[PDB]
Amino acid sequence: AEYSIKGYLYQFLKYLSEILAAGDGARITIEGAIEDVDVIAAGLTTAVQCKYHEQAEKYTLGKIYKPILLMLEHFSKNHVSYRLFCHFPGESGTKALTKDDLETVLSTKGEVLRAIVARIDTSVDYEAFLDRFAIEFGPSAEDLQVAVLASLKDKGFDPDDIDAVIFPNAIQRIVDLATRSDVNDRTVEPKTFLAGLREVRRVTFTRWTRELATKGRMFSSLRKSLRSCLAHNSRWRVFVINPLTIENFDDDIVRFIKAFVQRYSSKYLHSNPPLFMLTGDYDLSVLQKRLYDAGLRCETGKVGGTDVIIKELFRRPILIRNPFRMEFSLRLAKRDEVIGGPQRRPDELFLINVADDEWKHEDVNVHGFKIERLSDLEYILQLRSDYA
Amino acid sequence: RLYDAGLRCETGKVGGTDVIIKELFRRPILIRNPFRMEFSLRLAKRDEVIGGPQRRPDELFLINVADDEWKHEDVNVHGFKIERLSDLEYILQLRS
Amino acid sequence: RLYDAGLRCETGKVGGTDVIIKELFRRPILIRNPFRMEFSLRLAKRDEVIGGPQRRPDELFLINVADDEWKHEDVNVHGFKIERLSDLEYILQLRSDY
Amino acid sequence: LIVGDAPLMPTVGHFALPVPEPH
Amino acid sequence: MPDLGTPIGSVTDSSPSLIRIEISSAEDFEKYKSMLGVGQYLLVASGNNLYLLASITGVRATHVNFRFQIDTQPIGTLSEDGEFSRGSHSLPVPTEYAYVTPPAVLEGIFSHQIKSPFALGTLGISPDIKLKIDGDRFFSKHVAVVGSTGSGKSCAVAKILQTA
Amino acid sequence: MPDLGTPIGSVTDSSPSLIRIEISSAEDFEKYKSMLGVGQYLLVASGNNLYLLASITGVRAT
Numbered sequence: 001a002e003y004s005i006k007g008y009l010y011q012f013l014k015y016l017s018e019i020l021a022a023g024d025g026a027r028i029t030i031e032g033a034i035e036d037v038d039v040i041a042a043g044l045t046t047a048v049q050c051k052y053h054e055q056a057e058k059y060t061l062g063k064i065y066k067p068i069l070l071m072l073e074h075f076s077k078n079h080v081s082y083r084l085f086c087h088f089p090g091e092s093g094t095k096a097l098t099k100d101d102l103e104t105v106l107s108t109k110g111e112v113l114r115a116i117v118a119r120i121d122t123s124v125d126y127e128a129f130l131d132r133f134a135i136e137f138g139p140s141a142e143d144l145q146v147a148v149l150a151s152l153k154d155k156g157f158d159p160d161d162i163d164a165v166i167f168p169n170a171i172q173r174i175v176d177l178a179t180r181s182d183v184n185d186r187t188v189e190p191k192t193f194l195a196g197l198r199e200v201r202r203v204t205f206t207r208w209t210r211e212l213a214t215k216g217r218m219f220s221s222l223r224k225s226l227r228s229c230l231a232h233n234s235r236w237r238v239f240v241i242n243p244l245t246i247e248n249f250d251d252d253i254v255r256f257i258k259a260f261v262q263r264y265s266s267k268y269l270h271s272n273p274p275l276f277m278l279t280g281d282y283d284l285s286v287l288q289k290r291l292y293d294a295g296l297r298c299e300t301g302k303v304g305g306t307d308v309i310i311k312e313l314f315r316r317p318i319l320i321r322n323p324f325r326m327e328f329s330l331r332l333a334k335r336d337e338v339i340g341g342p343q344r345r346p347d348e349l350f351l352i353n354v355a356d357d358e359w360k361h362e363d364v365n366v367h368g369f370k371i372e373r374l375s376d377l378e379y380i381l382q383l384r385s386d387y388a
Numbered sequence: 389r390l391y392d393a394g395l396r397c398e399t400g401k402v403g404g405t406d407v408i409i410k411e412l413f414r415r416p417i418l419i420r421n422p423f424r425m426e427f428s429l430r431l432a433k434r435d436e437v438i439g440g441p442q443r444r445p446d447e448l449f450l451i452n453v454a455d456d457e458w459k460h461e462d463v464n465v466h467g468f469k470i471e472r473l474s475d476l477e478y479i480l481q482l483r484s
Numbered sequence: 485r486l487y488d489a490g491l492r493c494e495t496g497k498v499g500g501t502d503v504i505i506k507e508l509f510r511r512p513i514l515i516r517n518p519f520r521m522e523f524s525l526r527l528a529k530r531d532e533v534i535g536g537p538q539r540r541p542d543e544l545f546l547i548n549v550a551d552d553e554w555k556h557e558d559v560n561v562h563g564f565k566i567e568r569l570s571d572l573e574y575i576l577q578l579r580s581d582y
Numbered sequence: 583l584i585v586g587d588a589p590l591m592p593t594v595g596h597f598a599l600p601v602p603e604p605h
Numbered sequence: 606m607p608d609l610g611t612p613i614g615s616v617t618d619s620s621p622s623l624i625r626i627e628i629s630s631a632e633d634f635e636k637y638k639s640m641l642g643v644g645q646y647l648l649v650a651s652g653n654n655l656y657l658l659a660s661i662t663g664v665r666a667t668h669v670n671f672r673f674q675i676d677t678q679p680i681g682t683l684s685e686d687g688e689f690s691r692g693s694h695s696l697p698v699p700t701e702y703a704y705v706t707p708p709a710v711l712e713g714i715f716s717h718q719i720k721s722p723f724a725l726g727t728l729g730i731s732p733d734i735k736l737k738i739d740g741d742r743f744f745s746k747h748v749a750v751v752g753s754t755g756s757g758k759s760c761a762v763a764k765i766l767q768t769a
Numbered sequence: 770m771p772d773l774g775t776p777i778g779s780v781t782d783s784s785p786s787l788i789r790i791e792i793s794s795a796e797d798f799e800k801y802k803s804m805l806g807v808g809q810y811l812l813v814a815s816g817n818n819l820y821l822l823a824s825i826t827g828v829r830a831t
């Protein structure tokens with residue numbers, strides 16, 4: 001239930017700090033954590049587990065009660081090296097408590113504390129925990145991240161670009177290869193990252209990146225970048241989406257579409273309805289009916305409902321001023337069925353969790369994102385005031 | 389084939405395999421100048437149309453069918469038996 | 485049934501059973517553009533209508549009735565005998581075919 | 583709007599704030 | 606920022622100085638007549654996510670059905686978040702909608718962009734609201750008060766000095 | 770000298786002092802609204818290989 005997210009993050013930043021001050025021909029390998037459930041047990045069974053606590057002026061046994069204790073349940077349950085991270089003023093050193101300290105801590109006067117320790121099994125090789133466990137005194141998150149980016153500027157980059165597009169990206173690759181279910185090489189080559197991160201152009205909205213401290217300033221840059229694009233009445237915009245990674249998708253796809261068409265496809269000066277495309281094996285008919293229930297119509301480009309005709313899918317609709325009547329408001333299809341291309345190219349293409357597409361080209365703008373909840377994308381497009 | 393010929397049709401479906409009465413019977417958009425029209429005919433099968441319309445029809449034509457549920461005393465029913473379709477065009481004034 | 489077919493009628497009654505001549509022989513509202521008409525026909529039963537109008541009818545068609553109280557020397561009277569309604573359609577030019 | 587002998591022709595333009603800001 | 610409701614009318618003619626609006630229903634005019642007087646303000650749309658404040662300077666009503674005309678002058682711009690800027694560059698194309706300014710918007714504008722508040726009374730359409738002019742610049746310089754007999758000049762001066 | 774692209778509109782009246790231009794599409798105007806304000810400049814043709822600079826003094830939309 002704990003999951004110690006911030007500690008789990010601390011050693012990722014440690015790893016990137018290790019790669020930071022490193023010479024050529026140096027390699028480092030990460031080892032995942034047991035929070036992932038994989039019988040394959042890939043990674044040499046070299047998992048690591050950590051926890052993080054702060055606000056203690058000088059080291060004592062009393063201050064650090066619960067952490068070490070809570071580790072032992074894991075042992076009783078079943079190369080899993082337990083470790084602890086913390087920073088306290090005047091304490092800069094790594095230690096290993098010997099036998100008498102373990103026997104000191106074994107007994108606990110706090111009763112509800114031992115209430116669960118009763119869960120512990122008797123068969124414990126006491127000194128294994130001690131020799132395996134190690135305590136680390138390193139700088140707290142604040143200054144460590146401060147120096148992280150302060151030095152990341154040292155290589156030579158644009159001062160602002162690093163905040164919103166680079167620093168969130170690397171930690172993502174790190175923790176990805178950390179806990180990826182299927183196997184691959186942990187070995188990391190330093191110089192090649194510089195080659196990859198330079199060319200990579202994407203923004204990442206995910207569970208780990210939000211916890212990062214800089215988050216809160218990556219939102220607004222993206223919000224202010226798209227303002228010039230979304231202040232036009234007549235434009236041709238395209239969307240592609242992959243619904244595997246997204247959470248709670250079947251219940252949130254509809255509200256998003258309604259909110260978008262309410263503001264961007266609801267008047268006489270809006271003469272080019274948008275297009276939505278999905279990749280996979282999704283069933284559209286249900287979505288079509290659920291939207292009709294709300295009061296909207298769609299163009300699917302099917303005369304007889306076997307295959308697609310491109311010319312009908314890219315036609316212009318009828319409009320009437322007084323009273324307003326709109327033939328259709330949005331376009332829907334599946335990417336596999338659409339074969340060919342439009343007579344006129346997109347002005348803006350959006351790709352959500354898609355790696356590449358055939359319509360990319362020099363004139364088109366290609367925004368890219370990695371999303372886990374759709375509520376995040378609305379704030380980017382100015383359909384709500386506050387983020388999650 | 390009708391789409392290739394040039395015409396557009398209304399069938400009543402909203403994406404699925406079932407037919408909806410309110411969408412089947414509805415008024416089209418029109419523009420006087422230049423002339424534009426949304427659809428010119430409404431097509432279907434009898435078995436799928438489960439129900440009846442809001443406004444009864446003025447004329448019901450039947451070609452080789454005996455009786456239908458939409459027959460009423462206040463509705464004009466015209467019933468025929470023909471062997472070729474070219475015969476009906478003459479009746480309906482499309483040829484001489 | 486006429487209402488279901490889409491037509492409105494003037495019957496000449498105000499709540500009660502009795503019938504009022506002045507409220508059955510009155511002029512309707514008319515709006516020229518767009519065209520609207522308050523009502524298109526009158527209805528009644530003969531026995532209930534006791535009295536007469538101030539302006540006498542021009543034409544009094546009688547279909548299968550011998551004599552009435554509204555016949556006069558200065559009114560045009562046409563009496564017929566029919567067996568089914570469709571014959572009157574021909575007589576009065578609604579449908580050409582007999 | 584700049585007008586006078588210096589400009590090629592009368593023109594209008596938009597400033598950009600200076601660095602450091604004067605105070 | 607808030608929801609604005611239903612629009613009252615659409616634009617018919619535009620120019621960098623004058624904007625003209627037309628209503629065609631009597632019920633709507635009768636519904637909003639309290640807020641369509643001279644001196645009041647309207648919101649006009651100039652593209653997605655941007656608004657233009659204008660001041661009413663003329664109303665007319667003619668039947669031969671009903672026509673209602675309103676004339677305005679641009680003052681400045683207001684975005685979605687709430688920022689307000691003097692200087693109207695843009696021109697709103699015809700077919701655009703016009704809405705009636707809700708009081709909360711003006712309350713906020715006065716709250717955030719006046720350095721030294723000084724209440725000079727109450728707003729016209731809504732008595733609850735208060736009108737905060739800049740006190741620092743009023744007293745620093747001169748003033749003039751003019752009015753005809755029976756209009757309440759002396760009580761007004763009295764109120765000003767009393768709060769002073 | 771360099772390619773100028775597609776034009777906004779055509780002339781509909783002329784004189785030694787005044788010149789009047791006419792646009793007919795909403796998309797084009799909405800596309801070039803940033804460049805069609807008062808005090809800005811336009812190029813008009815006269816014969817072949819000769820251009821005329823003009824300054825805007827008024828705009829109207831109906």
Ligand SMILES: Nc1ncnc2c1ncn2[C@@H]1O[C@H](COP(=O)(O)OP(=O)(O)OP(=O)(O)O)[C@@H](O)[C@H]1O
Pocket residue numbers: 753754755756757758759760
């Ligand atoms: N705020 C008010 N609202 C309504 N009535 C008022 C108000 N203040 C004062 N009155 C009443 O109306 C009069 C307001 O005008 P007052 O005579 O005070 O100034 P004035 O008309 O400018 O005087 P004069 O014209 O003689 O110089 C007062 O005499 C009082 O009876």
Ligand SMILES: [Mg+2]
Pocket residue numbers: 758759
């Ligand atoms: Mg006085």
